[PDB]
Write a protein that binds this ligand. Structure first.
Ligand code: HEM
Ligand SMILES: [K+]
Ligand SMILES: [K+]
Length: 387
C-alpha cells in the first residue's frame, strides 16, 4: 500500500503527481492512512462516479459530534432520503436563482470595502472568507445586526484541531443562536430559508426545530470554507494561466463555463473534500477490480476530473471547455445541495473582480504562496494582490 495523503507539491498550482501516474497505470490501488488503516483509492472518472452513485457505498461513519450525526452528509438512505426531501421543500433552484441579485450586491459591497484598504491587500481575509458567510446569512435569514457576531462564530469554526475548544464553543453558540432565530422568524417570517422551513415544520411534516438547526449549521459548514478556499485558488490559477484569463476579460458571458472549468481543475482535496465511503457488499469496477465488502474507498475526484477518457487535454486549463461533466459537486444522492448556489457565488465573485480590478496581480512571487498545513481543504494562507 502507498501512503495517503500524498506529499504536498511545492507549488499551490500542482497536484500530487502520483494521482495521474496511478490513474493512467494501475488505476485502483491500495492505500495506507497515517493511523495504519488500509483502504482503496479509485481514480478514473467512471469509478469515482460509481463510488458516489452506487447503493453499496455507505457514508455512515459534544455538540459538534451530535451535529455530525444529524448532517445530511453523514446519512444513508432511508434517513437521508427523508431529510433531503424535507430540506428541498425550501432549498429550491428557484430560491437560489432568485438570490443572484443579492449575491451580486454582497460581492460589490465587499469589493467596495477591499478597495479602501492599504495595498497590497490579502484577498483571503478581506473577501474570500467573509463572502460565503454573507451569502449564507442572506439565504438563511440572519439579519445584518447579527452578522458581525455570526462571522466571529463562523470564523472560529474554521480553526485547526489545535483549537477543538474554540470550535466546540462556537458550535454551541450557533446552536443557541439558531434556536432564538427560529422564534423570531416564527413571529415575523421573511423571504429566507429558515422562515420557510419553520412553516413546513409547523404544518404537517415531521420536520423538527432541531433538524432546522442542524440543517442551518450543516449548510454553514459545507459552504463556508469550501467556497472561501475556491475563490482565492481560482484567482491564482487564472493568473498562472494568463492566456485563459484573457479570454474572460470583457466577456462576462464566458464566466459560467470558466467557473465550471475551474471547479474541475482546482480541486478541494484529492477526494474533492469527500469523506471516504465504506462498501457494504463487494463491488466490481469498470476495469474488473472487485472491491471487497467492508472496505474504506477514496474517490479521487481531483484526478478523475482530468481523466483523458472524458476530458480532452484534461491536465490543462481551458476556460472555454464546453464538454465538462466534472465531479466537483459529487454525484448520486449526496450531490452537493449547494451546487447551483456555489456556482452563482463564484461567478459573481470572479466576474466582479475582473470587472473592477482588471489589472489584478499577485503582490508576491507565486512560489511564495502556500497551502495552510492545518486545513481539511486545500486553501491559501493569504493571497496578497494589487491592481
Ligand atoms: C465550491 C463550493 C463547493 C464545493 C466544491 C462543494 C462540494 C460538495 C461535494 C463534493 C459534496 C458531496 C459530499 C459527499 O458525497 O460525501 C457536497 C455536499 C454538500 N454540499 Fe457542497 N460544495 C460546495 C459549496 C456548498 C455551498 C455553498 C453549500 C450551501 C448550501 C453546500 C451544501 C452541501 C450540503 C448540505 C451537502 C450534503 C448534501 C447531502 O449529503 O445530501 N455546498 N458538496
Ligand atoms: K493527497
Ligand atoms: K446538513
Amino acid at each position: 500500500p502507498i501512503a495517503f495523503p500524498f506529499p504536498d507539491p511545492p507549488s499551490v498550482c500542482e497536484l500530487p503527481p502520483e494521482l495521474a501516474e496511478i490513474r493512467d497505470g494501475q488505476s485502483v490501488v491500495e492505500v495506507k492512512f497515517p493511523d495504519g488503516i488500509s483502504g482503496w483509492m479509485v481514480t478514473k472518472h467512471a469509478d469515482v462516479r460509481k463510488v458516489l452513485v452506487d447503493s453499496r457505498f455507505s457514508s455512515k461513519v459534544t455538540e459538534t459530534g451530535k451535529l455530525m450525526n444529524e448532517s445530511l452528509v453523514g446519512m444513508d438512505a432511508p434517513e437521508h432520503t427523508r431529510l433531503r426531501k424535507l430540506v428541498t421543500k425550501a432549498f429550491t433552484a428557484r430560491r437560489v436563482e432568485t438570490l443572484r441579485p443579492r449575491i451580486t450586491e454582497l460581492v460589490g459591497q465587499l469589493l467596495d470595502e477591499l478597495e479602501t484598504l492599504p495595498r497590497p491587500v490579502d484577498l483571503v481575509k478581506n473577501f474570500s472568507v467573509p463572502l460565503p458567510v454573507r451569502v449564507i446569512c442572506e439565504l438563511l435569514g440572519v439579519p445584518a445586526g447579527d452578522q458581525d457576531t455570526f462571522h466571529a462564530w463562523s470564523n472560529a469554526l474554521l480553526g485547526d484541531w489545535q483549537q477543538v475548544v474554540e470550535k466546540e464553543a462556537a458550535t454551541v453558540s450557533l446552536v443557541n443562536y439558531f434556536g432564538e432565530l427560529i422564534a423570531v422568524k416564527r413571529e415575523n417570517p421573511a423571504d429566507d430559508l429558515i422562515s420557510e422551513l419553520i412553516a413546513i415544520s409547523d404544518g404537517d411534516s415531521t420536520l423538527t426545530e432541531r433538524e432546522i438547526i442542524a440543517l442551518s449549521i450543516g449548510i454553514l459548514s459545507a459552504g463556508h470554507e469550501t467556497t472561501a478556499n475556491q475563490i482565492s485558488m481560482f484567482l491564482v490559477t487564472l493568473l498562472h494561466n494568463p492566456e485563459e484569463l484573457d479570454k474572460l476579460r470583457d466577456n462576462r458571458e464566458a464566466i459560467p463555463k470558466a467557473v465550471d472549468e475551474l471547479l474541475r481543475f482546482v480541486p478541494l482535496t484529492t477526494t474533492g473534500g469527500i469523506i471516504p465511503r465504506l462498501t457494504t457488499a463487494e463491488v466490481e469496477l469498470s476495469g474488473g477490480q472487485v472491491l471487497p465488502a467492508g472496505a474504506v474507498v477514496l474517490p479521487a475526484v481531483a484526478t478523475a476530473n482530468r481523466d483523458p477518457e472524458v476530458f480532452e487535454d484534461g491536465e490543462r486549463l481551458n476556460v472555454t471547455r464546453e464538454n465538462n461533466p466534472h465531479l466537483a459537486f459529487g454525484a448520486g444522492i449526496h450531490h452537493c445541495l449547494g451546487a447551483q448556489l456555489a456556482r452563482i457565488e463564484l461567478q459573481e465573485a470572479l466576474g466582479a473582480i475582473l470587472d473592477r480590478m482588471p489589472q489584478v496581480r499577485l503582490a508576491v512571487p507565486e512560489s511564495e504562496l502556500r497551502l495552510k498545513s492545518a486545513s481539511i481543504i486545500r486553501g491559501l494562507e493569504s493571497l496578497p494582490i494589487t491592481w
